[PDB]
A = this chain, B = another copy of it.
């Protein structure tokens, strides 16, 4: 039933594995958090703009423009979407090593053991002690948006999701969303003479959308004995592959036939002379077949315009880039490696004195990357040994500029392009994402492995109902109210489908393994262990350890 002095739920953070048959595993991940909620700093919906002129008023600083318009709401959201919420590091190891693909099934959520307290300051003076006592009749307002009427607002974008540590309490993310506003910011370079427009526009009768939680939602009122339960949500998603691909566009198909086996282990094999070699090529006018010029089934990976900034009405923004392997040439931005910034709750370490910690994720698929300094375009009719005018290298100045080269603006994407879908990032990364409502849709989102086809799981919104003092004027601009905060337990259940991997290879596969301390190896075990004072860190685990044959 429930009431004062009776718990409305239980605490389960453990993860379970059922083996359903041959190779198939049902993974059930329970997660529970104690959540700390503060009375909102304003009772009102606010429409606020951040316009930073100090940064953008001076030339060439375009890329740091923050200017936008947002609706601030008194509500806060409980957002469970990150991988670090659901699993402990060893679970991720076990899944990553043993399973060929995995998929989302269902999601459950609960709120229980609501506690609301009021704060009074007794013994006013140098002592200034605070007294804490229960308000048994106070309520917490809870709303779930199942129909996704409100703007969809993943909390992991700002790393505001529930913490990754079962035994540490966590806080909600305050709910907010963008509002339509036009921005004009002119494009300049460093120390350029002129004037930067740097203006924002008036509200648009066309594009204005102001949503209210109270008008769009059914709000449940939870006192202490109350509990709230979301129904079971079911994902419709495609499974993601947990094995990386090594196999480049030059590894596809049948190798050339060697003339004979080499005599010693140090010797190299030889091939039929390229003039006499059989094969298929799209080069005209030459009788040759070379491993580089032979036709392949598809383009694996593609060149992407990198550090591309395009401007629509809202302002400049960087065009996303499909994550691919940074090659031996290490260039990160061409291949669009992800870079995370996160706090102690989600990562970092309590030993760290910095405000945030940063990690650059490199794609684990060694096939589709591009190494730009070694890319080139050659003139037609094709020739062996091109001269300087017959080949375009990455050392060539585009539009007479020293640091701009054709690979900056070059886009090779086309019908023949094939690339792997990027990989989940265990402690910090977005599990699922809502699909855009546009008619023509992207083939993949960049940050999130799973995209909900029809309807995303709802956003769970909470706030404290206001406690009013004895004096309340509805027409007053300032509102006096009782200082109040609350805590509650969030529990959720995430079910996944996965399948065990085969091993057909003679040789041992790569695995995620712990390593002794004292060597600086990334997997050195002490990083997953507590310290003497209880400091702990949770760092990104490599994913997709095991290789796969593409073709």
Contact = CB atoms under 8 A, between A and B. Distances in A.
Interface in A455-510: 465-470, 472, 474-475, 477, 482-483, 485, 487, 489, 500, 502-510
A453 interface: no
A278 to B, nearest CB: 4
Nearest to A487: B468
A252 to B, nearest CB: 8
Given A49-B269, A310-B370, A532-B267, A338 B282 contact: yes
Interface in A161-212: 163, 166-171, 173-174, 176-178, 180, 182, 184-187, 189-192, 201-212
Nearest to A305: B412
Contacts of A97: 97, 511
A43 B168 contact: yes
Interface in A255-301: 255-258, 260-271, 274, 276-285, 287-301
A156 to B, nearest CB: 8
A367 to B, nearest CB: 7
The 10 A-B pairs of least Cβ separation, nearest first, read: A44-B534, A207-B246, A421-B439, A311-B374, A379-B403, A11-B219, A284-B332, A205-B514, A202-B517, A248-B314
SS of A interface (majority): loop
A529 interface: yes
13 contacts: A7-B220, A10-B221, A12-B219, A14-B217, A63-B292, A176-B254, A184-B328, A208-B525, A216-B504, A284-B333, A390-B404, A416-B445, A416-B446
A303 to B, nearest CB: 6
Contacts of A293: 63-64, 317-318
A66 B271 contact: yes
A249 interface: yes
Nearest to A243: B437
A465 B6 CA distance: 14
Contacts of A551: 151-152, 434, 436-437
Given A278-B342, A340-B280, A516 B205 contact: yes
A378 B403 CA distance: 9
B166 A202 contact: no
A516 B206 contact: yes
A387 B201 CA distance: 29
Contacts of A214: 11, 13, 32, 166-167
Interface stretch (A85-93, A103-111, A229-237): A85-93
Nearest to A288: B64
A98 interface: yes
Given A189-B390, A311-B374, A448 B333 contact: no
A165 to B, nearest CB: 9
A543 interface: no
Given A221-B11, A304-B414, A60 B530 contact: no
A28 interface: no
Given A159-B279, A299-B442, A371-B313, A225 B391 contact: no
Nearest to A224: B5
Contacts of A149: 502, 504
Contact of A508 (B121, B217, B251, B523): B523
